[PDB]
Ligand SMILES: Nc1ncnc2c1ncn2[C@@H]1O[C@H](COP(=O)(O)OP(=O)(O)OP(=O)(O)O)[C@@H](O)[C@H]1O
Ligand SMILES: Nc1ncnc2c1ncn2[C@@H]1O[C@H](COP(=O)(O)OP(=O)(O)OP(=O)(O)O)[C@@H](O)[C@H]1O
């Protein structure tokens with residue numbers, strides 16, 4: 019059976035992310051959302067918060083599971099029984115970054131990457147910008163899953 | 176079972192194209208290469224030549240078949256039993272063009288598109304440029320499948 | 333009083349276009365939609381059809397009028413009592429094209445151009461793609477104003 | 490009356506910036522340059538220096554005033570009596586960044602953003618690069634207003 | 647001795663082009679401007695006009711000569727005693743196009759291409775846009791060499 | 804005699820870098836690789852390691868020498884007897900960054916920059932990504948010169 023890994027920091031997961039999960043889940047036998055926390059401790063939500071938000075936001079996808087990633091995505095793919103990497107693209111910047119990483123990943127491990135285009139309505143949505151706006155008092159609730167909104171409302175006070 | 180359509184004009188098919196076919200075929204149960212001939216009669220090879228070149232260049236992919244496309248790709252996908260569209264991206268220009276078409280296709284029919292990154296060695300390869308160079312006496316044989324080279328050698332004299 | 337010209341071919345006008353008109357009309361005392369028909373006779377709707385579709389789609393904008401353009405946009409701006417040009421940007425390609433034309437226009441006539449970002453939901457909408465999809469039997473009615481849909485329904489049969 | 494906010498860090502203000510101010514001031518009843526100092530204390534000039542440099546560089550624009558910004562630009566716009574945001578674009582990178590922020594700003598507050606193209610002669614001018622060159626002994630005086638040059642000459646020794 | 651070919655259609659040559667010639671001529675022992683006329687007869691100036699305009703605009707560059715090109719640029723380079731191709735880049739679009747052609751040229755013939763960045767003041771200048779503006783009555787004389795202006799003034803009436 | 808400076812951090816030098824050196828060395832009388840270490844102490848290899856890796860990787864280029872850079876590249880060019888700067892471009896991002904720096908460098912010192920396109924096979928290779936992959940246990944030996952591989956093998960344990 020085929021399997022797609024969707025790696026990312028998901029800090030926090032957005033509706034753009036969930037859209038990608040849904041589209042991967044419709045095409046692959048199983049999907050694994052791999053949460054990679056960047057070495058620099060400066061992130062809004064801790065690993066367990068990130069995991070819980072993704073799980074709670076994907077209860078409608080029975081063939082998806084959430085796991086913490088360690089090391090190279092390609093090692094996660096090969097060791098943990100997947101067949102491909104799936105990532106979303108919003109912009110030309112995403113494309114350039116992801117193209118480089120995909121070619122590097124194919125080179126080092128023979129692992130393929132498939133990209134999907136953002137839904138137009140979420141094209142401007144990013145975890146970073148949503149966090150920045152939320153912290154300055156802006157309403158980003160329409161851009162994030164309810165389980166994230168619930169936690170953002172508590173975290174801001 | 177899942178099924179990917181890889182639409183294009185393939186005039187002629189290149190090693191970049193075959194690379195995409197191979198990568199789709201490894202991920203989807205079946206692949207259909209859909210040849211769409213553009214209304215303007217100005218193309219190098221006729222439909223039957225295009226079909227034959229793709230077939231001859233993909234004998235190593237048992238789960239791939241070649242068909243002529245008519246009308247919207249999304250109608251081909253829905254009527255003819257596929258589940259997704261697969262396209263390759265070499266450049267920022269490809270990305271912008273393909274992003275627009277993918278969003279349009281999702282809007283009109285709910286059909287998803289997955290993109291794959293060009294292999295680095297074929298990033299500069301296009302049917303148009305290969306044809307243009309070949310017609311001016313340049314050697315493009317390393318960029319095209321042997322069945323195409325064989326036919327290009329005959330067509331040039 | 334300030335005045336913005338929104339030049340384009342509008343063949344046909346889309347909801348993306350109307351969105352730009354609305355945003356210009358909210359900022360400038362008056363707006364003039366200038367229809368420029370390209371020398372090559374290959375366009376879907378004739379000048380009068382184009383004019384009527386824009387008028388019918390902008391009845392809610394009392395400070396907007398529709399006119400046919402001739403020659404340089406900058407001459408239309410200076411002679412016909414406007415103060416600026418307003419154009420929409422969807423993509424990096426639009427940006428590069430429009431940047432060049434804006435700098436050229438500032439150079440030759442001192443006329444400024446202001447750009448507005450596409451609404452995310454219409455980012456993939458273009459007259460060309462909508463026409464192409466419609467002619468192949470695709471449903472683009474959610475992307476175009478009703479006065480355009482009405483005429484497209486008649487033109488297709 | 491219409492009003493444009495031109496937000497930025499202006500550390501320091503450049504001739505590219507002043508060019509944008511001039512073009513906004515010619516189109517809007519009033520302009521407010523909103524200085525936003527980024528949380529990280531690593532900036533060349535303190536808030537008061539930044540304010541003074543902009544004021545001194547815009548004495549020829551009677552309808553412009555300088556203010557310090559706090560929080561979301563869109564809140565500054567709505568509370569402080571403006572109608573729009575105006576920003577300059579030099580490059581594709583600026584376009585992608587500003588497009589995202591404009592769509593986010595329209596989403597959260599309904600506030601429009603208008604972009605203007607850089608003057609060709611200042612396209613390569615940025616506060617960061619000018620500061621970096623100046624600190625290594627390069628002559629950037631033709632890229633910055635005299636009030637900035639005067640202060641840069643003192644700051645370097 | 648080193649030699650650079652600067653291929654193009656030069657219809658007509660602009661000040662942007664001359665800027666590139668000057669910069670190549672300062673770096674290479676000799677420069678050859680190779681005029682390639684595109685198969686489609688739709689160009690403003692005939693080959694001899696193009697040749698004359700370049701010659702007349704480069705009298706200050708003793709190490710430059712003008713020639714008509716036939717076939718692949720790389721064949722002109724190898725047969726006619728040059729060592730490299732030199733081309734200018736204004737935009738991201740130029741970069742993508744020229745990158746592809748350079749990689750193709752290196753592949754087929756081992757010939758290197760060096761790119762130079764446009765001067766900021768000519769970044770928006772192109773033969774096509776200048777011709778289009780001139781034909782609509784716009785003043786482009788500051789963008790073109792005097793020998794071109796002289797001929798454009800005669801051609802317009 | 805002509806002379807090209809190829810500035811960079813080379814931390815570490817990659818096969819992409821060596822490719823550029825080779826292509827510069829074939830066109831200019833001499834080449835100087837100028838190693839610029841960024842103020843932030845966070846780099847993998849110290850200056851002397853960087854110098855040694857470049858020297859050891861370029862023994863086949865008799866007209867190339869390696870030096871440490873201080874201050875503006877343009878001062879190194881003018882004082883140290885070079886005539887031009889040479890840099891490689893892989894991506895649209897490189898192009899935008901390098902275009903800005905080249906225009907700034909021409910403005911402040913009259914020094915020209917020539918760009919060369921990446922070899923397709925190294926387009927995705929960067930020092931940063933190679934280091935990141937290597938530190939996570941990925942095999943990047945095909946992307947780096949043997950003298951770098953030898954040192955990377957020791958540094959990882
Ligand atoms: N709206 C969206 N549509 C499609 N893909 C997206 C969207 N937002 C993010 N992605 C993709 O999801 C993947 C994981 O994203 P990740 O959480 O690592 O960063 P991110 O959302 O880009 O964060 P930021 O935008 O703040 O840098 C990446 O491929 C990213 O491009
Ligand atoms: N080297 C390559 N790597 C990956 N995808 C590619 C490559 N070359 C073409 N493609 C993709 O293959 C699909 C079909 O291509 P098609 O034959 O329609 O045009 P094309 O190869 O782009 O022709 P041209 O480049 O001459 O316009 C498109 O998605 C295109 O982006």
Ligand SMILES: Nc1ncnc2c1ncn2[C@@H]1O[C@H](COP(=O)(O)OP(=O)(O)OP(=O)(O)O)[C@@H](O)[C@H]1O
Pocket residue numbers: 339340341342343347348349352418419420421422426448449450451454455456457458459460461
């Ligand atoms: N969805 C949109 N959002 C914002 N601006 C748009 C949108 N669609 C078009 N525009 C802009 O409207 C202006 C006039 O467009 P015009 O009718 O000339 O061509 P167009 O819509 O780009 O047609 P095509 O996309 O088929 O080439 C241009 O500035 C264009 O960039």
Ligand SMILES: Nc1ncnc2c1ncn2[C@@H]1O[C@H](COP(=O)(O)OP(=O)(O)OP(=O)(O)O)[C@@H](O)[C@H]1O
Pocket residue numbers: 496497498499500504505506509575576577578579583605606607608611612613614615616617618
């Ligand atoms: N030369 C220029 N022409 C037009 N707009 C500009 C120019 N330089 C900066 N801008 C715009 O001015 C606004 C405020 O700029 P800000 O001071 O925040 O950063 P900046 O000049 O981009 O600094 P840096 O380039 O160092 O990051 C932004 O919209 C920016 O894009």
Ligand SMILES: Nc1ncnc2c1ncn2[C@@H]1O[C@H](COP(=O)(O)OP(=O)(O)OP(=O)(O)O)[C@@H](O)[C@H]1O
Pocket residue numbers: 653654655656657661662663666732733734735736740762763764765768769770771772773774775
């Ligand atoms: N202002 C400029 N600065 C630097 N290089 C330029 C400039 N204008 C054109 N060039 C380059 O000169 C070379 C030859 O140009 P050519 O005459 O073939 O077309 P062009 O000027 O791009 O015409 P158009 O812009 O109308 O398509 C190309 O490399 C082109 O990128």
Ligand SMILES: Nc1ncnc2c1ncn2[C@@H]1O[C@H](COP(=O)(O)OP(=O)(O)OP(=O)(O)O)[C@@H](O)[C@H]1O
Pocket residue numbers: 810811812813814818819820823889890891892893897919920921922925926927928929930931932
């Ligand atoms: N594969 C490549 N092909 C051509 N040029 C390259 C390649 N890799 C790097 N360069 C260029 O070499 C020059 C010096 O590179 P430098 O070591 O400063 O950074 P870098 O390789 O871009 O590092 P990183 O990619 O990690 O930021 C720059 O012009 C860079 O664009």
